[PDB]
Ligand binder design. Structure first.
Ligand SMILES: CC1(Sc2ccccc2C(=O)O)CCC1
Length: 113
């Protein structure tokens, strides 16, 4: 399938134990994709103060289209020192490893795979 339906647990930035996927744009995009498959990927919503508390490179999910079955269509866009690798819509948040943190909510997304 080109698209996959996922329910991503939304985590509080201060609860997050592992604050990024790695050290290169190519690595964070690979680890992000792997965690999304193993269902070990969380989502932190981007506000004032949130990105400085997380490790670059960032991986964002951004809106790719305007929502089958309640699931918003999104795609992966890494960012490193102000440059993004990818081009897409509004940020739904930043992806992080999930290692058992209690979510505040769930975000239903359709991921281009
Ligand atoms: C990481 C995809 S692939 C995927 C994701 C979750 C569950 C199953 C699969 C699969 O390929 O079968 C979404 C990012 C590319």
């Amino acid at each position: 399938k080109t698209h996959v339906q996922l329910s991503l647990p939304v985590l509080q930035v201060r609860d997050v134990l592992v604050r990024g996927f790695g050290d290169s744009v190519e690595e964070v995009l690979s680890e992000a994709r792997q965690h999304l498959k193993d269902g070990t990927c969380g989502l932190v919503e981007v506000e004032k103060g949130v990105l400085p508390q997380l490790e670059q490179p960032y991986v964002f999910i951004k809106r790719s289209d305007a929502a089958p079955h309640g699931h918003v269509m999104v795609e992966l866009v890494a960012e490193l020192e102000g440059i993004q690798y990818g081009r897409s819509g509004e940020t739904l948040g930043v992806l992080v490893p999930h290692v058992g943190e209690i979510p505040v909510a769930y975000r239903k997304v359709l991921l281009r795979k």
